Amino acid sequence: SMNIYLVLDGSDSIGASNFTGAKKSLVNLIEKVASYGVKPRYGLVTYATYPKIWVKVSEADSSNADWVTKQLNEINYEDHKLKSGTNTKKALQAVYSMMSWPDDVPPEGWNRTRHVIILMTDGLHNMGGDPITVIDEIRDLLYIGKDRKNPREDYLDVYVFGVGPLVNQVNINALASKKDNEQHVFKVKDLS
C-alpha cells in the first residue's frame, strides 16, 4: 500500500517555463511508477500564498494513473491566485490533512502504508515559517522515529526536486529525507 503526494510550487519565483517542466516530470514519474505494475493512491497539490488540493488520496480514482495524469495536465500556471507569496509550510499542512484519520483512531492497515511526498520547489519560501515542523508532525502521526526497535523510517520518504536557476539549496536539503546510501534531493532535469 502506498500514497504518493505530488506537491508543485506554483509561485512567481518558479516561472511558467520551469513550472511546465515540473509538470512534465511528474507525468513521466507517474508513468515510470505504473510501469512497475503498482497502484498507489495519489494526492495532488499546487501552492503559492495558499495551497490548492486538486486530488485527495481518499478520492475514488486517486489510484488510476491515467485519470491522475489527466488532472495534472489540466493545471495551468495561471490557475493559481496570489503567486506573489510562497508558503511551503501550508502546502505540507495540506498533505498532513490528507493523512488525517477519519475516526479518531489509526485506520485499518495504517502501519502498512508507505507515504511518499514529491515536492517540486526552489526552496524560496517567504511566508508561513519553517516547513520542517510539518514534516515532524507527519512523522509523529505516522509513528516514525518513535519506537527505538521499530523506527518505521521505511514508511515515509520525502523527495525534493529543485526547480529553476534560483534555489535555496539549504532549504531544499532540509526538507528531503536523509537516508544512508540513498539520494532524496534532485533537480527537475532528473523516484517513488
| Residues making contact with Mn ion (CB under 5 A) | 11, 13, 86, 124
Is the distance from CB of 47 to CB of 5 less than 8 angstroms?
A: no
Select 33 or 94, whichever has its Cβ closest to Mn ion. 94
Least Cα distance to 79 among 54, 42, 43, 62 occurs for 54
Least Cα distance to 175 among 163, 166, 162, 164 occurs for 162
113 is in an annotated binding site: no
Could you tell me the smallest distance in angstroms from the CB atom of residue 8 to Mn ion? Answer: 12
20 is in an annotated binding site: no
Select 127 or 132, whichever has its Cβ closest to Mn ion. 127
Report how far apart, in Å, the C-alpha atoms of 93 and of each of 24, 69, 90 are: 25, 23, 5
88 is in an annotated binding site: no
Could you tell me the smallest distance in angstroms from the CB atom of residue 112 to Mn ion? Answer: 36
Could you tell me the smallest distance in angstroms from the CB atom of residue 21 to Mn ion? Answer: 15
Is the distance from CB of 175 to CB of 158 less than 8 angstroms?
A: yes
Residues flagged as binding site for Mn(2+): 11, 13, 86
Residues flagged as binding site for Mg(2+): 11, 13, 86
